[PDB]
Structure formats: C-alpha cells, structure tokens
C-alpha cells in the first residue's frame, strides 16, 4: 500500500500538466492552417 496512490497521483498530475500543452498544441496546429489558403495544391488549376 501507500505506493499505488502516490504513483497514480504523480502520473495523473503529470497528465494534468500535459493537458494544457496538448490542448494548446492541437489548437495551435489547426490554427496555423488558417493563414494563407493557397491555390498551389496538386489539384487541377483554375481555367
């Protein structure tokens, strides 16, 4: 005893320190994509 609780609390606090980073990272990752909106893709060009 007394180790499962400490192990679980340290890991859960680590994940709760990781959640701010990963939510900021995912929002930043999808937020980068809104800058230029190119037409230089490999699809067919205009006209």
């Amino acid at each position: 005893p007394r180790l499962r609780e400490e192990m679980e609390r340290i890991v859960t606090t680590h994940i709760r320190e990781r959640e701010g980073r990963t939510k900021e990272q995912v929002m930043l990752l999808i937020d980068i994509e809104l800058a230029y909106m190119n037409t230089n893709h490999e699809d067919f060009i205009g006209f």
């Binding site: 180790l3 400490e6 340290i10």
Partner: protein, 48 residues
C-alpha cells in the same frame, strides 16, 4: 523522471511497507521450511 520524483518524495519506510500478508507469508514459509527439513531429517534417520 518517475524514479526521481518517487525518490524525492518520502519517506522510504512509509512509501511501501506492511501489508502484514507478506510478512505473515514469509514467516509461514520459514516455519514450514523448518518443519519439512525436520521431516526430511526424520525420514533419513528412519531409512539409515
């Protein structure tokens, strides 16, 4: 970092301790050990 955090926090005794099941378990292991060694000795005595 897990071992570092666990070693930083204390105490060493209260971190993992009894749990009297394992202490009673090893005590029973030793008592059965002495009794069975005695039985092997008695059987050897009877055979010789």
């Amino acid at each position: 970092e897990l071992l570092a955090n666990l070693y930083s926090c204390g105490d060493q005794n209260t971190l993992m301790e009894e749990s009297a099941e394992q202490a009673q378990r090893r005590d029973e292991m030793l008592r059965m050990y002495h009794a069975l060694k005695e039985a092997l000795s008695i059987i050897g005595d009877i055979n010789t």
